[PDB]
Structures are given as C-alpha cells and as structure tokens.
From TrEMBL:
Residues 19-234 form the Beta-lactamase class A catalytic domain. Keywords: Antibiotic resistance, Disulfide bond, Hydrolase, Plasmid, Signal. Its EC number is 3.5.2.6. Pfam families: Beta-lactamase2. GO terms for molecular function: beta-lactamase activity. Gene3D superfamilies: DD-peptidase/beta-lactamase superfamily. NCBIfam families: bla_class_A, blaCTX-M. It comes from the Bacteria. It catalyses: a beta-lactam + H2O = a substituted beta-amino acid. Belongs to the class-A beta-lactamase family. The gene is ctx-m-14. This is Beta-lactamase. GO terms for biological process: beta-lactam antibiotic catabolic process; response to antibiotic.
Length: 261
C-alpha cells in the first residue's frame, strides 16, 4: 500500500529499523510494518507492569492504596518522582502513575517486585493471551537494546493487540481499565513522539520508551473526535550503541498513518 511504501521510505531516510502496528477498531483492520519483528520495549514495558498490578487489585480491592517504602538503595538512573519520596512511601497507585506518566524507573522496579519479579510481569502477558511479550530484567538493564538480543522485547503486532485489550477491551475490570486509560492520557513524556504527528484535536494516551542503540518507542491509544479509536505502536532502533533518540521518526510515522483514515 501507499502507507507501507511511505513507511519504508521513512525508515530508509532514518538509517534505523522501524516497526509499526496500527489497529483501527472501526473495522479491526491492521496496518503492519515489520509487525512480527522483535524490538526492545524499553519503558513501553511499564504499561504491562502497571496493568498486572491493576489486575491484582480486582481481587485485592485496596491494593492500590498500599504504601511502599522508597529507600535510597531503591533509586536507579531516572527517578523523577521516586526521588521526591525517598525515606517516605508511595502507594501502588502513585508508583503506577509515576511509572507511566513520568517513566520513573524506580517505580517500575517496585511494580516488578510486587509481581514477584519479571516472570510475574511476563505471566500476566501470557494470561491475557500475549505469547510474545517477554520481560527478563529490571530497570535499568532492560534498556540495553542490544541488536538480536531477545530479552525484554516484543513485536509491534503483539503489543498493539495487547494494548487494545488492556484499554479498549476487557482484559481488566471496568474500574481498572478506566484507570489505565486515565493514566495513559495524562502521560507527560509523549509530546514529541506519536502525538506530534497527529491532529491536535485528537485525544491520545501513550507510553514512550527510550534506550540504548538510539531506541525510541511510543505506544498509543488514539481517540479521534467522531471516529472509532485507533491503537498505534511505533518502535525504532538504530545500529550504533550511542545513537541519539529519534522521536521525530515516531511523529512522522504517526503522520503517515493518519493520512488515509
């Protein structure tokens, strides 16, 4: 299609490897570019950890209000919110919000611990039918994004389907789904990524990710005004370990997708 030729040209111009999956929930049509290739998830994995905790809260009704101590030893490389609460507590809801809306890496590690390790995050993916997602490491090493390394990867197709199920489907309870949507809509890190390629009038909930090898990711649910929502995953990684981030590639991919709907 025209869209796949334009995405291929964008990729060629960028020097890296681009993966895109779009689901249009109007007709359940999909647009895929490198849709079944593995990409390092980096912080887009935080969505799965937060959603796993939300699933636990369907049975443990008070779980999100549980205080969790933030100790100095818990801090890792990027902790914008947890830093503000060292030697204090944050609830699991506050940790989930921090992980999602500020990409806080300490918060992610606390979510992983609550789930019993990375295997507990992966288990949740399997339980909702995602056989592709794998979380192997904690923060910050899950962002190494080494070419060929299957650790901490998923595919665009799988992540788009999972994000659809978590936000627009019923993999979570009604209260939990609404909370996840609220959290994604309040993301603060996405302005230069998918959102920048879309009409300003559309409502977006997203989670970005970034890592080594210039890995630059964003996953989004998109609510256009007067039109069924869309799920869009954009993954991008580069051949040089120290490559700079390329959020503009994600914005451009979103813009190409948005032409034609």
């Amino acid at each position: 299609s025209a869209v796949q030729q334009k995405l291929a040209a964008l990729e060629k111009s960028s020097g890296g490897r681009l993966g895109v999956a779009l689901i249009d929930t109007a007709d359940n049509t999909q647009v895929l570019y490198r849709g079944d290739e593995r990409f390092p998830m980096c912080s887009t994995s935080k969505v799965m950890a937060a959603a796993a905790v939300l699933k636990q809260s369907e049975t443990q009704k008070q779980l999100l209000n549980q205080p969790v101590e933030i100790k100095p030893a818990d801090l890792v490389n990027y902790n914008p919110i947890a830093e503000k609460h060292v030697n204090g507590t944050m609830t699991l809801a506050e940790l989930s919000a921090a992980a999602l809306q500020y990409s806080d890496n300490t918060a992610m590690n606390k979510l992983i611990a609550q789930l019993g390790g990375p295997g507990g995050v992966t288990a949740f993916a399997r339980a909702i039918g995602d056989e592709t997602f794998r979380l192997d490491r904690t923060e910050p090493t899950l962002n190494t994004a080494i070419p060929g390394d299957p650790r901490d990867t998923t595919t665009p197709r799988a992540m788009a389907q999972t994000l659809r199920q978590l936000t627009l489907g019923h993999a979570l309870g009604e209260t939990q789904r609404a909370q996840l949507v609220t959290w994604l809509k309040g993301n603060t890190t996405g302005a230069a990524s998918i959102r920048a390629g879309l009409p300003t009038s559309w409502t977006v909930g997203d989670k970005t990710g970034s890592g080594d090898y210039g890995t630059t990711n964003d996953i989004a649910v998109i609510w256009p005004q007067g039109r069924a929502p869309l799920v869009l995953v954009t993954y991008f990684t580069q051949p040089q370990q120290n490559a700079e981030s390329r959020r503009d590639v994600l914005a451009s991919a979103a813009r190409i997708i948005a032409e034609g709907l």
